[PDB]
Structure formats: structure tokens, C-alpha cells
Amino acid sequence: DNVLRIATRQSPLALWQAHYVKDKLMASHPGLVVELVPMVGLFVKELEVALLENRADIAVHSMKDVPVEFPQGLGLVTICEREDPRDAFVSNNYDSLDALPAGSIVGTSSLRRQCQLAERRPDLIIRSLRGNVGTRLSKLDNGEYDAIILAVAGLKRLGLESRIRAALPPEISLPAVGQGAVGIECRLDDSRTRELLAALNHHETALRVTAERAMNTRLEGGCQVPIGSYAELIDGEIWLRALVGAPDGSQIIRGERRGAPQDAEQMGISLAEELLNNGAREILAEVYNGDAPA
Numbered sequence: 001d002n003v004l005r006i007a008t009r010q011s012p013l014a015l016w017q018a019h020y021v022k023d024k025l026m027a028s029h030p031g032l033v034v035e036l037v038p039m040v041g042l043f044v045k046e047l048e049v050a051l052l053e054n055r056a057d058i059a060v061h062s063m064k065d066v067p068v069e070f071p072q073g074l075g076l077v078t079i080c081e082r083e084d085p086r087d088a089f090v091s092n093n094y095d096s097l098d099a100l101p102a103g104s105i106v107g108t109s110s111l112r113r114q115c116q117l118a119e120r121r122p123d124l125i126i127r128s129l130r131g132n133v134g135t136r137l138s139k140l141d142n143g144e145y146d147a148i149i150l151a152v153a154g155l156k157r158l159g160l161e162s163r164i165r166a167a168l169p170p171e172i173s174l175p176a177v178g179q180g181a182v183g184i185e186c187r188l189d190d191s192r193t194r195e196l197l198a199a200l201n202h203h204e205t206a207l208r209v210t211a212e213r214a215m216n217t218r219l220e221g222g223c224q225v226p227i228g229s230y231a232e233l234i235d236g237e238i239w240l241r242a243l244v245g246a247p248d249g250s251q252i253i254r255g256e257r258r259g260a261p262q263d264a265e266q267m268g269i270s271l272a273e274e275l276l277n278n279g280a281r282e283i284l285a286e287v288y289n290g291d292a293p294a
């Protein structure tokens, strides 16, 4: 059966991602008929509903938005080639974070982004910002913020690379799990769909994201959590860095692991456990408020 139906969110960025996946599919399988089923754990739930009741065959997500847990019968089966994983400084009136005067307003609702900015620059005012990329840029242009923090990859994909005033190195702002990579979820028993997706998997990115996600999973993380988790392949090994921070920047718990790619999952679990035992458990508890990772 030649049809593959893609469930996606309906934003410009989300639809760009659905086209990316559709184009890769058509390139590998010229006989396929690819259909889009746009709609809408926050966002992914409706997509997963569609998979479970056979209205869609795959759901395409940005990796960092993929939940740590899945309903019976679904899973993340493909991790596509990673784009730039970094955060970006975006500003009309200033050329860097360094240039912002005390009391400047920087927008982001990421507690991961916030704790790290606040660690280094407690004089800056960090203000919530929500919405699609286009809307967030509008609020900036409208004067609501002196600067905002967005992902490099999103801006590049939307043709808005001119908005990247500065890319932030991972040592300055450690990325969200799988930032820059697209992931695909489907029904685990659907061997036809999984065979069609095989050509889209990028093994090197999949190794990195495996480590990162194992770390986050053990911390019972999500987007609403001040967690950084970021791996690179360096001289045949996976190098995983992680952090958990108090949003006010007062305490940031950090650690690292290096090892063979086949150990990606156990490395991430081990690192998570180390952070938990060195203060992260208590920080997370004040965020989930009560609930702590066991």
C-alpha cells in the first residue's frame, strides 16, 4: 500500500519539517504517494491520537518536543540528519549579549535558556515569550524585548538566517535534547512504514540524540524543565554534557561522560544519576513542585 500520511503541527516551521520529510521520502521511494494531515504532552498528543486511530502513519516533530514517554504501540523510530544545534542571540539594536546594558529585557520561556543566562548575567531581566517563530520576531520588532533567544536551526529553515546576530556556543548555552534534529514517530508494529523510513535515519545524529535522550529520560525531563543535554561524536567516541539549573542562575549542576557509541544509553542514564545525587533532584522538585525523579 503506496500511501504514507504525515501528521504535523500547522505552523510555518512545522510545515517546513513535514515537507523536508516528504521530500526525503520521495527521493528514496519515487512510487510513494505522500499525504499531509496537519492538525492541533502539550502539542504531540493530538498527533499521537491520530497515529493510534489510523488517521496518520507518521508524526514529524522537532526532537526537543518529543516526549520522554509514549503510549503503548508508538515510538520514535527515525532521527534525521542534525542541523546546527545551537541557540541564537537575536536583536535589532544590539550585536551580542555582552553589549546589553543592565536591566535589558531578554525573551524566552525556556527555563534551560533562562538559568544559564542568569548564571552569567544576573543584571539582565529574563521575560517569558511564547509563540511561533514569526510571532516572536514580531514582538521583538514591536519593542517588547531588547533581545530574544531562538534556535539557529529554526531560523535557518524559515529563511531567516539574517536574524542570527550571534550563535551561542554550547559552552555558553548548552542545547536542549536533540535541538537541530527532526524526529519521526510511528506505530511500532507498522513494518511497512518503518521500512520506508529507514533511508531517512542519520546514524551519527541518532547516536548523539540517544545519549541526550537517555539522560533526559532518567531526569523525567520535558520542555518545561531547566535541563541541558548535548552530545557530539569526537574521535570515535560520544561526548555527552548535561546540566540542571535553578532558573535564577544561583546553582547549576553540570557533568560529562565520554565513551563508545554503543554505550550511549547507559552513559546518559549514569550522568543523569550523578546530577541527581549532586543537587539536581532538589532543583527539579522545586520546578515540578513536589514530584522528584526516582
Ligand SMILES: *Cc1[nH]c(Cc2[nH]cc(CCC(=O)O)c2CC(=O)O)c(CCC(=O)O)c1CC(=O)O
Pocket: 062, 063, 064, 065, 107, 108, 109, 110, 111, 112, 113, 129, 130, 149, 150, 151, 152, 153, 154, 176, 178, 179, 180, 181, 222, 223, 224
Ligand atoms: C522543548 C521546547 N520547545 C520549544 C519551541 C521550539 N520547538 C522547536 C523549535 C525550533 C528549533 C528546533 O527544531 O530544535 C522551537 C523554537 C526555538 O527554540 O527557536 C522551546 C523554546 C522555549 C522558549 O525559548 O521559549 C523549548 C525549550 C527549550 O528549548 O529549552
